[PDB]
Amino acid sequence: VNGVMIRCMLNIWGVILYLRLPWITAQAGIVLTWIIILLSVTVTSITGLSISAISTNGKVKSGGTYFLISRSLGPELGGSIGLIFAFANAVGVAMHTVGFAETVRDLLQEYGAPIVDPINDIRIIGVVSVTVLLAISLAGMEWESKAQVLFFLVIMVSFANYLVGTLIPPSEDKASKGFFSYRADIFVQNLVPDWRGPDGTFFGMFSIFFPSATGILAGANISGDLKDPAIAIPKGTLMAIFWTTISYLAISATIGSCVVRDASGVLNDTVTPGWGACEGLACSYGWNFTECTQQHSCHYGLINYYQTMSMVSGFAPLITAGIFGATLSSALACLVSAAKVFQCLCEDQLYPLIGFFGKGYGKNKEPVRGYLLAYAIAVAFIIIAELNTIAPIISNFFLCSYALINFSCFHASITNSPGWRPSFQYYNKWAALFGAIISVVIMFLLTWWAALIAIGVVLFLLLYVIYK
Amino acid sequence: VNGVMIRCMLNIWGVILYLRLPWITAQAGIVLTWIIILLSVTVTSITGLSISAISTNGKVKSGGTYFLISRSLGPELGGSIGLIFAFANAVGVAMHTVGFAETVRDLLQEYGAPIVDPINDIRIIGVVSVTVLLAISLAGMEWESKAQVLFFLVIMVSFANYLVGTLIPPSEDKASKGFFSYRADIFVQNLVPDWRGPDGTFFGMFSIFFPSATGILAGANISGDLKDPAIAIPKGTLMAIFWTTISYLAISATIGSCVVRDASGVLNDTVTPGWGACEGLACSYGWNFTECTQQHSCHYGLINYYQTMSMVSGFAPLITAGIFGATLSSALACLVSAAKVFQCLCEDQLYPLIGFFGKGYGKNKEPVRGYLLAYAIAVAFIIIAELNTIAPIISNFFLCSYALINFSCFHASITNSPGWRPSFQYYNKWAALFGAIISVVIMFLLTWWAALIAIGVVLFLLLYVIYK
Ligand SMILES: [Cl-]
Ligand SMILES: [Cl-]
Ligand code: NA
Ligand code: NA
């Protein structure tokens, strides 16, 4: 609980929940958003059942996630799955850091002190933030162990503030920005999808959303340090998945039934007595959102404003603190996981080239080189400075890693390996096979060339080892 | 020569050479057509080197192509490669039959006696033609052995007639339909691509053209009946590939340097002095092709008329006879190959289900059931009655078969199997690996979902057997 459930819930809850989920709901309608969430949760639930079977298998040693997977499924697939997982965690660090940078940039713009321009402002904020994160990670772990509860408390306060703000009747300033109390007609209108933009498709938004359902391996990271990991890991992981899914569904429905898609934000844009016009719901409450809809120059609303969740709630700085806590926790966990995976992969000497990056230093032999490699990849991907572009890469790589773990578990089951005998009672071979197949199909549906690159990397890694 | 080179040359030369190659040239320009031809010939030449290495391996027995491949590379991949090859040959039978049906429909329309409507006319003509082909194939082989030389002579006469017609200065009726003598400006204009229609893309037209470079396995079909197959098969196959490539290149350049893209066909459409608005290279010879160019209703020309190779030549019925000979030879060879592959695959009892279709009948134990299955698939695909729609499926399936044979040969080379030791001196492992990789990449560039289906079928077949 204190080392399995809470860590998984903190790693899963990240940047997408606070900045892109209302936008995804507005773009894709509540029903299709629910379908996206349910499909992603089925994929992650099959993966979680496979992970629980792996963790329950045999005797758990103090080796970590990569060591557990390697000793459960053999090094031939363990090396490739570890490398892909590490790359996915590094690009996830980049995504969480750029989300934090966007939040800080918006806060600075609210102060009214821009530096040069929004994109480069994001760039400097992200690089400074990731450098500070590297310094903190190299400092020690007691601070983050103490700050885990702080992050949890802050995010819970953020959730409570959001719910209270939804329950409060709308104010004039919030009404001008497209926020009204719970309404049946708003829910009816938001039931149907309304696509916009270049990435306004079902599978594009699935690719954007999917990183918000990842992070289920975190509970396994400290499998060796748990007193009773064999019972704690599966129940904790599954409960974390269930509660995060419930939170996603509730937030999606509540935000979709409360605010309209298009808003102007102009305070003097009320529906004056005498001549005036009706646009959608607005006219029913004394607002005229016509010209903003026609010229497509709406700076606010659920479909245009990414920070509408902060506007809806009662006291915005609590939401900002929740965003900071979620992003920092997710980014730090991803960085630690990537560094540990890189170090442990280089320890086993899978390839002669990777060995030169496996010589740790420091008093406690901390793997400085792995942290520096992860930092370099994180900066290289932060240079992009676009959340909607970094998200699909992580979606693709996490889908590939889940496909490999599911298919490897299926192959071990069907082949009847001598040393592989799980004791989990909810594991089935055909469920894992279906999960692997559907994950590969979704991977190719999202982006075919990225899927080809990932499969080519998998085949290269395997074939190289199987041959040599 | 008489059993390797000529058979390969007759099987390669088919419907695409006579009906779609001028259209492909008009769509994609001479330079890109040459690039398409060279890329396709590179793939087929790597596959031909692999085939030559397989044929040279060990001692050749009277078993045919499937038996040779299975005894050279093992049954695990042999079964899957045979099944995919048989399916590709069946759909190729469908393609050649529908091309023959289109030719007969055009002849009937020229006679002025349509039956019901062009598409269903194609349907009945194709069904009757494939039934007659089945009856002829079940009759005996002496007739086709005697008619091979007739088909060769007819197609050579067709080529000579085409060249002579190109050399003859244009006539008034041919000029009105868009045919002029060799011209530098026409060549210059046709050097640049001009895309049109829904499939007017580089890779779509590659998919359409690719079946015209296939049929290189035919020379191996009678490997057991050759006195000296080990020397005859590689040289014959490579010479056939070279000469077919030269013919394709020469025909493409000659047709692209001789006829303009757009033509009207109206005989009274000359450029009367002082009248008619003028555009295009037809106004240099006293023609006014502007009106149909603006309305996009040009019924003739290289860009619209599929039967322009017949009008270009001197005496059209010779071209029609050549079309009949090429299509009949290709279709009959594909049907025989598909039936033989189906029968030999069912003989080995790879799967329990396929055995029920492996019980041959007749006095000589001819595989009637395999012929009926191939006939059923051929009719099911003829029902489509569209050459440009049947072609990509065949492209994908030969691409899959070639990728599998190349990769299997590479794997046998690198793994150093005990019984696999070719003696061909032009074979290299990395060439085969490059061929397999480029074939898979081209497959996914053509159609990603068809590629996924083919790879899933391969994995299902390979995995089923590897597990059981
Ligand atoms: Cl994860
Ligand atoms: Cl072939
Ligand atoms: Na978090
Ligand atoms: Na032919």
Alpha-carbon separation of residue A322 from A315, A329, A388 (angstroms): 12, 11, 21
| CA angle, residues B213, B215, B219, in degrees to nearest 5 | 130
Q: With beta carbons less than 8 A apart as the criterion, state whether B212 and B17 touch.
A: yes
DSSP state of A171: P
Could you tell me which of A283, A296, A93, A51 has the C-alpha nearest to residue A194? A296
Rounded to whole angstroms, the Cα distance separating B60 from B106 reads 45
Alpha helix locations (H) across B366-447?
Answer: 368-382, 387-415, 429-446
For the stretch B227-233, contacts whose Cβ atoms lie closer than 8 Å and that sit 24 or more positions apart, written own/partner, are B229/B55, B229/B60, B230/B55, B230/B56, B230/B60, B230/B423, B232/B1, B232/B3, B232/B4, B233/B4, B233/B51, B233/B52, B233/B55, B233/B56
How many Å separate Cα A199 from the centre of its chain?
18
How many Å separate Cα A7 from the centre of its chain?
14
Alpha helix locations (H) across B257-367?
Answer: 290-295, 308-312, 316-347
CB-nearest partner of B448 from A414, A444, A467:
A444
Which residue in B448, B453, B458, B463 has the most chain A C-beta atoms within 10 A of its own C-beta, making it the best mutation to test that interface? B448
Q: What does residue B179 show for φ and ψ, rounded to 5 degrees?
A: -115, 125
CA distance A441 to chain B (A): 8
Rounded to whole angstroms, the Cα distance separating A259 from A312 reads 8
Phi-psi region of A129 (alpha: psi -120 to 50; beta: other; left: phi over 0): alpha
Give residues whose Cβ lies within 5 Å of ion ligand 2. Answer: B 214-217
How many Å separate Cα A45 from the centre of its chain?
16
CA of A219 to the centre of ligand 1 (A): 10
CA of B326 to the centre of ligand 4 (A): 3
Helix (H) or strand (E) holding A459: helix A448-467
Rounded to whole angstroms, the Cα distance separating A394 from A84 reads 10
CA of B343 to the centre of ligand 1 (A): 49
| CA angle, residues A36, B451, A440, in degrees to nearest 5 | 35
User: What would the two tokens of residue B162 be?
Assistant: 């085409």
User: What would the two tokens of residue B77 be?
Assistant: 């991949």
Rounded to whole angstroms, the Cα distance separating B103 from B82 reads 31
**DSSP-based three-state secondary structure for B287:** strand
Q: With beta carbons less than 8 A apart as the criterion, state whether B411 and B403 touch.
A: no
> What residues of chain A lie within 8 A of the CB of B444, using their CB?
448-449, 452
User: What would the two tokens of residue A289 be?
Assistant: 């959102």
Q: With beta carbons less than 8 A apart as the criterion, state whether A137 and A336 touch.
A: yes
User: What would the two tokens of residue A191 be?
Assistant: 């039931």
Rounded to whole angstroms, the Cα distance separating B423 from B410 reads 15
Q: With beta carbons less than 8 A apart as the criterion, state whether B351 and B461 touch.
A: no
Sign of CA dihedral B182, B184, B190, B191: positive
| Terminal Cα-to-Cα distance of chain A (whole angstroms) | 43
Who contacts A387 (Cβ-Cβ below 8 Å, separation ≥6)? A15, A19, A20, A95, A98, A99, A102
Question: How many domains are contained in chain B?
Answer: 1
> What residues of chain B lie within 8 A of the CB of A415, using their CB?
467
Residues 405-464 of A with CB under 8 A from B: 414-415, 441, 444, 448-449, 452
Who contacts B241 (Cβ-Cβ below 8 Å, separation ≥6)? B8, B12, B41, B44, B45, B48, B216
Q: With beta carbons less than 8 A apart as the criterion, state whether B163 and B250 touch.
A: no
Q: Which ligand is nearest to the CA of A217?
A: 1
Q: Is A329 annotated as a binding residue?
A: yes
Q: With beta carbons less than 8 A apart as the criterion, state whether A73 and A245 touch.
A: no
The residue assigned the tokens 């499969």 is A455
Which residue in B449, B453, B459, B464 has the most chain A C-beta atoms within 10 A of its own C-beta, making it the best mutation to test that interface? B449
Q: Which ligand is nearest to the CA of B338?
A: 2
**In DSSP terms, which residues pair with B287 in a beta bridge?**
B270
Which residue in A438, A439, A449 has the most chain B C-beta atoms within 10 A of its own C-beta, making it the best mutation to test that interface? A449
Who contacts B136 (Cβ-Cβ below 8 Å, separation ≥6)? B143, B144, B332
User: Which of B71-109 are b and which e, b meaning 16 or more Cβ less than 10 Å from the residue's Cβ?
Assistant: bbbbebbbbbbbbbbbbbbbbbbbbbbbbbbbbbbbeee
CB-nearest partner of A444 from B415, B441, B452:
B452
Q: Is A270 annotated as a binding residue?
A: no
CB-nearest partner of A448 from B415, B448, B467:
B448
DSSP state of A300: B
Cβ–Cβ below 8 Å for B444 and A448: yes
Alpha-carbon separation of residue A222 from A4, A9, A344, B194, B423 (angstroms): 8, 15, 14, 62, 57
Q: With beta carbons less than 8 A apart as the criterion, state whether B69 and B348 touch.
A: no
CA of A392 to the centre of ligand 1 (A): 15
Rounded to whole angstroms, the Cα distance separating B44 from B288 reads 44
**DSSP-based three-state secondary structure for B107:** helix
Could you tell me which of B380, B352, B356, B382 has the C-alpha nearest to residue B367? B356
Q: What share of chain A is helix, strand, coil (3-state, %, to 5)?
A: 70, 0, 25
How many Å separate Cα A330 from the centre of its chain?
8
Torsion of CA B429, B432, B436, B437, to 10 degrees: 60
CA of A391 to the centre of ligand 1 (A): 14
User: What would the two tokens of residue B239 be?
Assistant: 């010479």
CA of B65 to the centre of ligand 2 (A): 11
Length of chain A in terms of residues written: 468
Rounded to whole angstroms, the Cα distance separating B384 from B378 reads 10
Number of helices (H) and strands (E), helices first, in chain B? 19, 0
**DSSP-based three-state secondary structure for A260:** coil
Rounded to whole angstroms, the Cα distance separating B122 from A15 reads 59
Cβ–Cβ below 8 Å for B444 and A467: no
Q: With beta carbons less than 8 A apart as the criterion, state whether A190 and A261 touch.
A: yes
DSSP state of B259: B
| CA angle, residues A20, A23, A27, in degrees to nearest 5 | 135
Rounded to whole angstroms, the Cα distance separating A408 from A433 reads 9
User: What would the two tokens of residue A199 be?
Assistant: 């990435």
Q: With beta carbons less than 8 A apart as the criterion, state whether A292 and A298 touch.
A: yes
Q: With beta carbons less than 8 A apart as the criterion, state whether B61 and B230 touch.
A: no
Rounded to whole angstroms, the Cα distance separating A61 from A230 reads 11
CA of B60 to the centre of ligand 2 (A): 19
> What residues of chain A lie within 8 A of the CB of B452, using their CB?
441, 444
Torsion of CA A187, A189, A192, A197, to 10 degrees: -110
One-letter amino acid at B173 equals D
CA of B96 to the centre of ligand 4 (A): 9
Q: With beta carbons less than 8 A apart as the criterion, state whether A17 and A10 touch.
A: no
Which residue in B452, B457, B462, B464 has the most chain A C-beta atoms within 10 A of its own C-beta, making it the best mutation to test that interface? B452
Q: What does residue A466 show for φ and ψ, rounded to 5 degrees?
A: -65, -35
Could you tell me which of A68, A80, A47 has the C-alpha nearest to residue A410? A47
Rounded to whole angstroms, the Cα distance separating A62 from B38 reads 58
Torsion of CA B243, B244, B247, B252, to 10 degrees: -140
Q: With beta carbons less than 8 A apart as the criterion, state whether B246 and B429 touch.
A: no
Q: Is A50 annotated as a binding residue?
A: no
CA distance B47 to chain A (A): 21
Q: What does residue A133 show for φ and ψ, rounded to 5 degrees?
A: -65, -40
Q: With beta carbons less than 8 A apart as the criterion, state whether B325 and B15 touch.
A: no
CA of A403 to the centre of ligand 2 (A): 34
Q: Is A287 annotated as a binding residue?
A: no
Cβ–Cβ below 8 Å for B414 and A441: no
Q: With beta carbons less than 8 A apart as the criterion, state whether A319 and A313 touch.
A: yes
CA distance B415 to chain A (A): 7
One-letter amino acid at B224 equals G
Alpha-carbon separation of residue A395 from A259, A331, B27, B54 (angstroms): 29, 16, 39, 43
User: Which of B43-63 are b and which e, b meaning 16 or more Cβ less than 10 Å from the residue's Cβ?
Assistant: bbbbbbbbbbbbbbbbebeee
In chain A, what is the greatest distance between 2 CA atoms, to the nearest angstrom?
83
Alpha-carbon separation of residue B226 from A5, B3, B56, B232, B356 (angstroms): 72, 8, 13, 8, 32
In chain B, what is the greatest distance between 2 CA atoms, to the nearest angstrom?
83
Q: How many CB atoms lie within 10 A of CB A404?
A: 25
| Terminal Cα-to-Cα distance of chain B (whole angstroms) | 43
Chain B residue with minimum CA distance to A456: B437
CB-nearest partner of B467 from A414, A449, A452:
A414
Domain containing B50 equals 1-468
Rounded to whole angstroms, the Cα distance separating B191 from B206 reads 17
Q: How many CB atoms lie within 10 A of CB A326?
A: 26
Resolution in A for the shown PDB structure?
A: 3.0
> What residues of chain A lie within 8 A of the CB of B415, using their CB?
467
Cβ–Cβ below 8 Å for B452 and A467: no
Cβ–Cβ below 8 Å for B452 and A441: yes
